[PDB]
Amino acid sequence: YQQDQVVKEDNIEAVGKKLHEYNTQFQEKSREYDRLYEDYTRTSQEIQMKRTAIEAFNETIKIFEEQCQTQERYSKEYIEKFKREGNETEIQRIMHNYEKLKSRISEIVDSRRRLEEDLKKQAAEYREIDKRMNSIKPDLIQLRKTRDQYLMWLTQKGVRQKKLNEWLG
Amino acid sequence: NQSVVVDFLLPTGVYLNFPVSRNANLSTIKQLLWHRAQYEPLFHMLSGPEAYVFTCINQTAEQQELEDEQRRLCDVQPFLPVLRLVAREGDRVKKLINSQISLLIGKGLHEFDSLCDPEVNDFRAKMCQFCEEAAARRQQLGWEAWLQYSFPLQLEPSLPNRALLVNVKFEGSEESFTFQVSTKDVPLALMACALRKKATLVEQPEDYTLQVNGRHEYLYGSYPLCQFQYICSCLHSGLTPHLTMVHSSSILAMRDEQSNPAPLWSLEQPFRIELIQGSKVNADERMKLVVQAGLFHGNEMLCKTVSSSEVSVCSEPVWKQRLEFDINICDLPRMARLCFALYAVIEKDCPIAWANLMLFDYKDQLKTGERCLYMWPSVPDEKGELLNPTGTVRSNPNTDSAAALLICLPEVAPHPVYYPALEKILELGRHSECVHVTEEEQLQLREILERLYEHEKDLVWKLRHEVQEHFPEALARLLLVTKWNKHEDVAQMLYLLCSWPELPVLSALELLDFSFPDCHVGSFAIKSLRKLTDDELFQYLLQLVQVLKYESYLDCELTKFLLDRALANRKIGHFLFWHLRSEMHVPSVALRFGLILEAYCRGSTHHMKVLMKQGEALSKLKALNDFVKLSSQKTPKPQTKELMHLCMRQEAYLEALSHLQSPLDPSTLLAEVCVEQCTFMDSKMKPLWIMYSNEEAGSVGIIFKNGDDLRQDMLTLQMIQLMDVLWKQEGLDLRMTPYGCLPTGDRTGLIEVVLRSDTIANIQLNKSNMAFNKDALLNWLKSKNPGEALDRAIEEFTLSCAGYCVATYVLGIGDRHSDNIMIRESGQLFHIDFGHFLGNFNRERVPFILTYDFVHVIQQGKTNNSEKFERFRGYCERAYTILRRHGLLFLHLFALMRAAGLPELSCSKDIQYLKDSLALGKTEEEALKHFRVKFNEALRESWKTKVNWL
Ligand SMILES: COc1ncc(-c2cc(-c3ccnc(N4C[C@@H](C)O[C@@H](C)C4)c3)cc3c2CNC3=O)cc1NS(C)(=O)=O
Ligand SMILES: [Cl-]
């Protein structure tokens, strides 16, 4: 009784010719997916590097913010005792030193922000890769199942293993 | 440029910014800092330089107090060139360890904290405590015990009774005493005799041990001198041994370098789940998304896999569906596994991603409430299943960009519910024991258990009491016939497991496979693995590590077992460390492997120092290989070789690569780089060839290969080693050279250089005819073995060729040719670069292969020498037979390696290859007559191959 065969019956040479074609297309699409899966994994590593580099910027900035806390708390003592007793020159050094610290932080924040912009762009890549991967999968699967149906059709028909290997090579 | 601008934050609040050299050590920078600080405000408030320690944010985003100030800023390698001064004191011992662990293991310890996971926090708490105790307990005990931990004996698997001389000396004294001693002498005999040479009063022999000078290999215990690898290696070669007597005190000097730090079934309504929302889905808009779900236990389904409706494709698809499964809450087994797969479908099949969740948590509680499962991408393969129940349970680490199904396990009862304790299991399990006295089914079960199908399964289940009684080894067969989707059955089977007799190591290996998920099963398996000797455990350590990949929870028996053994034996620790460390780049295992490496490190602070030196050597080799890779594209090789050296001459490069224990063998010492002999090979990834020297020993070499994958070559070499042990254990030394191969990192590793060797292709290239050219291998062995030594050299070749012929047949390794087969000057054929195995490459069985060239050497140049050729046939036949006797060991081991995700070892066929190649389905007589037909046909083929060769 009836069974849903995808292969239309022509002859051994006609069917074997399509096995070579469908196998060639399968190996080529398998190369394509594997090329993307590298870019997937590589990007997944690169994003995770970037994500911890952002954390290191956070922690470094934290250290700078702690320095600002200290300076303001510490300066209180040696500005009263310096305002009286003449030394407004040291007050000016103390404070200009502080302004040089605050100015460095802005640069570190600027470089943090640049990496945040890279991670945003590289997240866009990752997603697009995965989208492209998921569009190629259904082709890769149906070409696998087609290739296998033609093998099984020829095996049933009684085609010798030497002949099948000519086509699959 | 050479110098870096560095930010300096002083504790007065003052900020100071100036250039310093990359090569400058931190102590030099602190001097420059104090010199500059003078002329900046509030200097007089600071204490002395020694009162403070630099702090910085390292590459792993963590603050590090930099205690060792003899370190270059380029090796400290802070994230930004920013150094902060802080108060020295505050338990500096624990601070320093916590820092070094992060850099050593690759992942930062704060990344465990960030997760806010109890399971992680309890693991760390429980295991770090456990390891800290053992290491403290190790430090208390004697020097002999410590010597056993640090340098366990390297014995042969073990007749001669010969006499041969041995050089001995003492520690410090230049002069040396050579004296005679027989093969079967216990080490004390040599020591006491060496002390008489010292006297002819002062010391006693039991406060001493012999060090094989050159290396960290010590000679002690009740075993005779002939069973030690060094002496055995010295006897076979003919060379004289060289030892050094060392005092007990001098060994306590190694031990005390540094100290370790101080210290219900009342819920019968069906199981169901709420599927809420997708997130961050990437798919084609024309298609529509479906989510298929199914409950699993091991590989088998518990019930039918119900699915969702087709919602339209978008980033944030929303279902809000109740999914009801055909199984009750009370029926669920302990390791019940809900498994998802998001599919993209044409409306009228693309697997996007998948995710698995354990229904019970690590504290035995049934999980309720919302869960945001971050999914893993589906990769298409030959057997495209709906779901992936063998896949991991921990979520995708990339929560930033990855997909996710949002679901919600409903509240089943007001108070929480657990899986019952072992007491309540044995309550239900003990009862309902019945149907004794059945004679007809004793033939039927024996027939069944001397070889599963559904008819046969119910018979095994009925006669489970008799299986335990008469067929104990068939536990795994019984475990699978047990219906895990009914809690009555699960109680009854567990009751038997508690009373089940201890199985042999072989049987217990099978029970570690993914098909046997239950905690009680794995526990029983380890119970039986606990009798492994350190030598035998080492032979399976790769496989045990891989099995962790399909464990459910972090704290498990297998992990505790591995850590137990690593803390007791430093060599096992060493190789456990690198097996784990080389997979920390793999997202699916990074956390699990991360937390274990922390535990090991905390109980192995001694070795932690050694692994740091290795890590930094490997750190520089990447940088060196990357320069060579880039240079090869630009210029010719000769000049790249001189340019490689110029990089190797540097302070940071020379010292990092100099003076470290080999990763391939921590007993082996890599001392002085021979930069003259350093080079790189012509190969796609251009792997570095680093030669060392040692005035104590003696010339070791390594290969740093980066870009290709070495896991398959390690597995293959592990197996050829395992074979060699099995052959040696039946008194057959086939002169194999299973060189060391260790994956250290992301497509990165070391390979042992076998000294005094060349490829068959290169040996034959000297005497070329350009279209007799033969006898090139035979001519070569004359120059390296003159006169009487040639007869040995031919025997080494015959013996070695036999083993490598059988090995390569059995493992199914093709693509064997002149430029990947190597001879040694001793005359030992050995194989390199096993890129493919088990028939892969296209997928056909690799026939047994004799080369004419090798047969000609075996026959000693003669056209017919059947006396000598029969010997070789016997060596092959004996070899093959022995491997069959241990066929199940190979199958079980390879079955666990399926965990590793190697392309060429991924399924039953790949395992079946080993079954057929070893003819395990046939009797030993039948197997061996089939091997002769293969042999004979390889011999007929041998002529036909070289007649075609022009
Ligand atoms: C896993 O992958 C590998 N497995 C093994 C090896 C390998 C290769 C050779 C060898 C092969 C061919 N030629 C030579 N030369 C002769 C020598 C006098 O001078 C050299 C510069 C060239 C040496 C020797 C050894 C090993 C392992 N232990 C050895 O002793 C290499 C790779 N990696 S690769 C490069 O990509 O094949
Ligand atoms: Cl940077």
Side-chain angles (χ1 to χ4, degrees):
Chain A
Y1 301 98
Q2 69 189 42
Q3 290 187 332
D4 295 25
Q5 301 186 175
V6 182
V7 184
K8 296 181 176 179
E9 305 210 331
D10 294 29
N11 52 83
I12 298 170
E13 288 296 327
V15 177
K17 179 160 182 173
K18 297 169 193 180
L19 174 71
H20 187 91
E21 282 151 24
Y22 282 124
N23 191 52
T24 290
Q25 289 175 33
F26 173 71
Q27 290 177 187
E28 196 171 36
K29 280 277 177 178
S30 278
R31 285 169 208 171
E32 191 166 26
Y33 176 80
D34 289 8
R35 189 209 173 173
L36 285 173
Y37 195 78
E38 285 189 346
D39 291 36
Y40 167 81
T41 57
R42 195 183 64 253
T43 297
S44 286
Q45 292 182 356
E46 287 190 20
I47 287 174
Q48 198 208 71
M49 285 188 73
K50 282 186 181 71
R51 194 168 173 283
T52 52
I54 286 174
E55 283 166 25
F57 271 120
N58 185 50
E59 208 63 22
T60 285
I61 287 166
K62 219 166 172 180
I63 280 291
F64 271 78
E65 300 256 49
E66 291 175 49
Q67 189 78 342
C68 293
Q69 194 185 350
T70 306
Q71 199 282 328
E72 294 180 334
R73 197 219 316 148
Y74 193 78
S75 60
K76 198 175 184 180
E77 291 253 27
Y78 300 90
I79 287 175
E80 295 170 21
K81 206 169 184 180
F82 275 52
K83 188 171 181 180
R84 282 193 195 172
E85 316 187 328
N87 300 352
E88 286 221 55
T89 181
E90 266 276 34
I91 289 173
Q92 201 168 129
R93 291 173 70 203
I94 286 166
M95 299 330 298
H96 189 234
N97 193 279
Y98 186 52
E99 295 299 332
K100 201 184 175 180
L101 185 66
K102 286 155 63 172
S103 190
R104 185 71 180 96
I105 294 177
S106 307
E107 296 176 2
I108 292 170
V109 173
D110 194 291
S111 297
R112 159 159 187 173
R113 174 259 286 157
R114 273 180 264 118
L115 193 71
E116 283 174 26
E117 291 179 0
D118 297 348
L119 181 64
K120 202 188 181 204
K121 279 190 185 180
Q122 201 174 61
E125 291 176 55
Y126 167 95
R127 284 196 65 165
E128 194 72 58
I129 294 296
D130 183 50
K131 203 178 199 180
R132 276 206 295 165
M133 285 204 312
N134 295 335
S135 69
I136 279 176
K137 280 181 204 178
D139 292 311
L140 188 64
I141 293 171
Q142 185 55 73
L143 285 167
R144 191 194 294 278
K145 295 196 175 292
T146 298
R147 196 275 310 282
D148 294 10
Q149 282 175 149
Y150 281 65
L151 265 180
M152 295 287 288
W153 190 93
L154 296 161
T155 311
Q156 284 160 13
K157 274 280 171 188
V159 183
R160 299 187 298 282
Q161 184 56 98
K162 290 182 182 180
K163 257 284 184 180
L164 300 180
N165 295 331
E166 290 189 63
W167 295 314
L168 292 175
Chain B
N1 297 26
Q2 204 69 29
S3 61
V4 192
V5 166
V6 175
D7 298 297
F8 295 91
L9 309 173
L10 303 184
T12 65
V14 169
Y15 164 64
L16 192 44
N17 174 242
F18 60 88
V20 192
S21 187
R22 280 171 165 75
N23 287 42
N25 66 311
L26 293 167
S27 197
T28 283
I29 298 175
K30 202 187 279 177
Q31 280 182 351
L32 293 157
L33 178 54
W34 248 254
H35 191 82
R36 297 252 197 173
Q38 285 189 133
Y39 303 115
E40 297 301 316
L42 304 170
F43 178 73
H44 291 305
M45 304 307 100
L46 297 172
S47 309
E50 304 298 78
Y52 305 97
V53 156
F54 282 125
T55 267
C56 77
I57 302 298
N58 63 24
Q59 296 304 291
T60 192
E62 282 187 338
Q63 283 181 59
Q64 183 174 359
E65 292 183 0
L66 305 177
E67 205 64 24
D68 187 27
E69 310 194 320
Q70 298 289 260
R71 298 191 70 209
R72 305 189 185 79
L73 189 63
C74 68
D75 303 325
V76 175
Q77 196 167 22
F79 178 60
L80 275 166
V82 171
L83 290 168
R84 189 210 202 181
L85 288 198
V86 304
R88 189 163 283 277
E89 297 175 39
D91 187 25
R92 298 200 311 283
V93 180
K94 192 162 187 180
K95 290 167 160 170
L96 185 57
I97 293 290
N98 285 18
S99 301
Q100 286 167 20
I101 291 184
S102 285
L103 297 174
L104 198 67
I105 77 199
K107 203 172 200 178
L109 288 173
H110 79 290
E111 303 205 336
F112 305 134
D113 292 295
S114 283
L115 300 173
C116 309
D117 198 337
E119 191 174 14
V120 170
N121 298 340
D122 292 20
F123 179 97
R124 292 183 74 194
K126 186 186 166 172
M127 290 295 159
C128 298
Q129 173 73 174
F130 183 79
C131 297
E132 278 183 53
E133 285 169 15
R137 192 168 49 250
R138 192 207 290 107
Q139 200 68 7
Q140 190 186 349
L141 298 160
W143 67 277
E144 293 172 25
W146 197 86
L147 193 68
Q148 200 181 143
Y149 158 71
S150 203
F151 312 110
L153 295 169
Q154 300 174 63
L155 290 168
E156 293 278 328
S158 196
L159 293 90
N161 305 312
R162 284 189 164 183
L164 189 63
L165 64 86
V166 49
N167 183 276
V168 188
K169 64 183 186 180
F170 287 91
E171 195 171 45
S173 192
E174 296 174 357
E175 296 186 323
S176 52
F177 303 86
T178 303
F179 60 90
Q180 66 178 28
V181 59
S182 298
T183 59
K184 203 176 139 196
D185 297 38
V186 159
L188 275 169
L190 189 148
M191 297 199 281
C193 181
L195 288 167
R196 294 158 216 164
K197 295 284 179 179
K198 186 176 176 180
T200 309
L201 278 163
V202 181
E203 307 300 320
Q204 283 184 335
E206 308 95 337
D207 300 319
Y208 273 96
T209 186
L210 295 166
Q211 186 188 348
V212 170
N213 53 255
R215 289 173 63 269
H216 283 272
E217 184 177 340
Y218 290 77
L219 277 57
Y220 57 90
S222 59
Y223 297 94
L225 279 161
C226 85
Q227 293 188 49
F228 295 94
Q229 282 173 17
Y230 179 68
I231 292 292
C232 171
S233 177
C234 287
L235 287 163
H236 207 92
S237 295
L239 298 171
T240 307
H242 275 69
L243 309 182
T244 294
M245 281 277 283
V246 177
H247 208 286
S248 57
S249 56
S250 176
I251 300 154
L252 295 160
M254 299 186 194
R255 176 172 134 286
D256 300 338
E257 284 176 23
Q258 283 291 313
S259 191
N260 199 244
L264 293 169
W265 298 318
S266 57
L267 307 176
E268 301 192 62
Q269 294 218 326
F271 176 82
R272 43 171 164 284
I273 188 168
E274 209 74 59
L275 172 64
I276 299 179
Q277 199 209 323
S279 290
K280 318 202 89 168
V281 183
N282 314 306
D284 210 305
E285 297 186 326
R286 67 187 63 95
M287 293 202 289
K288 293 195 166 180
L289 293 170
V290 192
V291 168
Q292 302 210 330
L295 286 161
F296 286 82
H297 183 260
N299 200 37
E300 294 289 292
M301 284 177 176
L302 296 167
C303 68
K304 296 183 180 180
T305 56
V306 295
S307 308
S308 315
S309 61
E310 294 87 51
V311 179
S312 57
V313 164
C314 55
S315 176
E316 304 291 300
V318 189
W319 283 272
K320 294 187 178 180
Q321 282 195 242
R322 196 179 286 286
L323 289 163
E324 175 159 292
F325 291 90
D326 194 355
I327 182 164
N328 297 359
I329 297 170
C330 52
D331 287 313
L332 292 173
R334 180 64 190 76
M335 308 296 154
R337 193 179 263 242
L338 178 60
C339 301
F340 297 94
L342 178 52
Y343 277 94
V345 192
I346 297 177
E347 196 188 327
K348 312 180 189 180
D349 268 21
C350 172
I352 304 298
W354 64 270
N356 299 338
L357 188 64
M358 296 283 292
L359 302 187
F360 288 81
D361 76 345
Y362 83 99
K363 286 274 196 69
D364 314 310
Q365 190 185 317
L366 174 47
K367 297 183 192 172
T368 64
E370 83 302 331
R371 311 286 162 166
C372 187
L373 298 175
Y374 295 83
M375 302 187 292
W376 293 97
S378 315
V379 56
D381 62 282
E382 289 187 324
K383 295 171 185 174
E385 296 179 332
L386 297 171
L387 296 157
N388 180 29
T390 55
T392 188
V393 158
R394 296 296 303 177
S395 72
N396 197 322
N398 185 8
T399 32
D400 190 13
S401 302
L405 282 163
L406 192 74
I407 65 93
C408 183
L409 293 83
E411 294 297 331
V412 303
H415 300 266
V417 291
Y418 302 100
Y419 196 84
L422 182 54
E423 289 85 55
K424 290 285 188 180
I425 292 169
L426 297 162
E427 191 180 40
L428 193 69
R430 182 167 172 177
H431 303 312
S432 306
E433 70 283 59
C434 261
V435 195
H436 285 100
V437 189
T438 46
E439 182 55 66
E440 174 62 53
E441 297 93 311
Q442 290 174 28
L443 264 165
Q444 204 174 320
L445 182 55
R446 186 168 277 97
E447 167 49 50
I448 288 160
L449 293 170
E450 283 181 309
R451 298 171 167 184
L452 251 167
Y453 292 82
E454 301 302 324
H455 154 66
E456 299 181 320
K457 287 172 192 184
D458 290 11
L459 180 71
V460 178
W461 183 248
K462 282 180 180 180
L463 315 192
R464 62 181 177 280
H465 194 270
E466 304 303 324
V467 172
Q468 182 176 43
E469 196 175 328
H470 301 143
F471 296 85
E473 294 195 339
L475 174 46
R477 294 175 176 77
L478 178 47
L479 282 166
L480 295 167
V481 309
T482 315
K483 299 177 172 180
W484 299 91
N485 67 327
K486 294 189 179 180
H487 71 274
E488 295 174 39
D489 291 24
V490 180
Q492 292 175 321
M493 176 48 37
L494 287 162
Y495 171 77
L496 302 169
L497 199 70
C498 299
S499 61
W500 207 279
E502 185 173 307
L503 299 182
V505 159
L506 192 54
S507 281
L509 288 166
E510 187 182 48
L511 287 165
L512 305 176
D513 214 338
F514 66 90
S515 312
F516 310 107
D518 197 285
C519 173
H520 302 90
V521 171
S523 190
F524 177 89
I526 297 302
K527 233 173 72 175
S528 300
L529 298 194
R530 286 193 197 284
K531 65 193 153 62
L532 290 158
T533 59
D534 288 338
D535 284 8
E536 199 182 351
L537 166 56
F538 175 66
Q539 209 65 60
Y540 320 144
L541 202 66
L542 171 43
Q543 285 76 27
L544 299 181
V545 178
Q546 299 312 311
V547 171
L548 297 161
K549 295 190 182 188
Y550 33 66
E551 294 284 295
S552 306
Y553 303 112
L554 296 172
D555 180 2
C556 61
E557 279 273 63
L558 178 49
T559 304
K560 192 174 177 181
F561 172 64
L562 292 171
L563 288 166
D564 263 305
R565 304 299 295 251
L567 296 161
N569 184 304
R570 201 176 77 159
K571 160 168 168 64
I572 287 162
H574 177 84
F575 290 109
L576 183 58
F577 167 89
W578 288 115
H579 288 343
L580 296 160
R581 183 56 174 84
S582 68
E583 305 220 71
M584 289 294 298
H585 64 106
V586 180
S588 57
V589 303
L591 178 59
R592 180 181 281 286
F593 284 20
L595 300 154
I596 298 162
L597 289 163
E598 189 197 358
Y600 170 73
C601 287
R602 288 188 195 287
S604 300
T605 43
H606 276 83
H607 200 258
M608 190 172 172
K609 193 172 180 180
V610 188
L611 293 161
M612 283 165 76
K613 189 75 195 180
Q614 294 182 3
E616 294 193 333
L618 293 160
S619 186
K620 297 284 175 185
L621 290 163
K622 181 62 165 65
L624 185 55
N625 202 159
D626 282 27
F627 194 85
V628 172
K629 278 182 182 174
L630 192 65
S631 174
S632 307
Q633 291 186 333
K634 299 179 179 180
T635 53
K637 169 160 184 190
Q639 206 68 16
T640 307
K641 192 172 160 175
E642 291 191 322
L643 288 163
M644 193 194 299
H645 299 152
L646 289 166
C647 193
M648 291 182 72
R649 308 307 182 171
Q650 282 200 125
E651 292 169 306
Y653 277 89
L654 187 63
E655 298 284 11
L657 295 169
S658 290
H659 296 302
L660 71 166
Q661 295 177 31
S662 167
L664 298 169
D665 177 0
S667 72
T668 297
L669 211 164
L670 314 187
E672 302 273 55
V673 294
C674 296
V675 178
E676 290 186 309
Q677 300 173 45
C678 284
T679 177
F680 73 104
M681 294 178 66
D682 180 42
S683 170
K684 189 66 173 180
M685 302 307 151
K686 302 191 181 290
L688 308 186
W689 183 278
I690 301 298
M691 287 297 292
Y692 284 90
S693 52
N694 193 12
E695 303 304 302
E696 298 292 323
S699 183
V700 191
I702 60 181
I703 301 178
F704 181 81
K705 192 180 192 176
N706 164 255
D708 301 322
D709 188 35
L710 299 170
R711 297 179 303 162
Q712 211 162 299
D713 290 83
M714 181 175 54
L715 179 52
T716 296
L717 285 151
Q718 200 212 41
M719 291 299 164
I720 291 176
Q721 190 184 318
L722 178 44
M723 285 175 192
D724 191 61
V725 160
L726 288 167
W727 292 330
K728 281 169 166 188
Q729 284 175 8
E730 308 295 325
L732 197 72
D733 194 330
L734 289 176
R735 310 312 316 166
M736 307 296 287
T737 309
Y739 62 78
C741 166
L742 190 64
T744 65
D746 188 5
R747 295 145 175 164
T748 301
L750 295 185
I751 312 181
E752 176 169 23
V753 173
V754 175
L755 298 167
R756 311 172 205 177
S757 66
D758 208 358
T759 63
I760 293 278
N762 284 323
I763 291 176
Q764 295 174 319
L765 184 52
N766 187 56
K767 299 290 186 180
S768 57
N769 194 38
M770 312 299 291
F772 52 88
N773 62 78
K774 62 166 182 180
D775 302 28
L777 297 186
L778 193 47
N779 283 2
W780 187 82
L781 292 165
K782 286 175 179 180
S783 60
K784 312 302 187 183
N785 295 279
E788 297 173 26
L790 180 141
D791 296 309
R792 299 176 198 175
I794 294 175
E795 198 64 23
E796 291 288 295
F797 190 91
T798 296
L799 288 171
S800 62
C801 178
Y804 281 108
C805 278
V806 165
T808 54
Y809 174 61
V810 175
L811 290 174
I813 311 187
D815 207 355
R816 294 292 91 201
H817 51 242
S818 62
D819 64 51
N820 70 14
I821 293 177
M822 308 198 74
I823 323 190
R824 270 213 259 178
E825 290 188 37
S826 70
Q828 294 166 126
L829 193 71
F830 75 92
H831 287 230
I832 65 177
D833 202 0
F834 308 98
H836 303 286
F837 75 170
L838 301 179
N840 279 281
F841 175 77
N842 293 45
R843 311 163 199 173
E844 195 179 53
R845 298 196 199 173
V846 174
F848 193 90
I849 288 171
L850 296 164
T851 311
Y852 177 88
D853 302 313
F854 311 155
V855 175
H856 181 268
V857 177
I858 287 167
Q859 292 188 137
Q860 311 171 309
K862 298 160 184 167
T863 317
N864 296 301
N865 185 9
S866 64
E867 291 187 321
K868 220 81 192 180
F869 192 75
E870 285 275 29
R871 262 189 169 177
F872 178 73
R873 196 217 304 284
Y875 297 148
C876 299
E877 284 178 357
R878 192 168 162 191
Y880 183 72
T881 300
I882 292 158
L883 301 200
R884 289 193 65 265
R885 295 201 181 83
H886 301 99
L888 290 138
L889 186 58
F890 286 101
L891 287 171
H892 294 333
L893 287 167
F894 269 80
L896 304 176
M897 278 306 297
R898 293 175 63 182
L902 290 168
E904 306 205 339
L905 175 46
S906 58
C907 66
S908 309
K909 282 189 173 182
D910 297 322
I911 303 301
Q912 192 73 47
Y913 192 98
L914 259 164
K915 297 182 190 177
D916 299 319
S917 88
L918 291 160
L920 298 182
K922 294 172 187 178
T923 63
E924 193 175 344
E925 187 84 313
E926 286 183 342
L928 201 61
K929 73 191 186 200
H930 204 102
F931 190 69
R932 290 208 193 81
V933 176
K934 298 271 180 172
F935 191 99
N936 287 23
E937 283 296 304
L939 189 64
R940 279 187 179 177
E941 190 68 8
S942 190
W943 282 65
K944 293 183 171 180
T945 312
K946 206 186 168 181
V947 176
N948 192 41
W949 193 294
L950 286 162

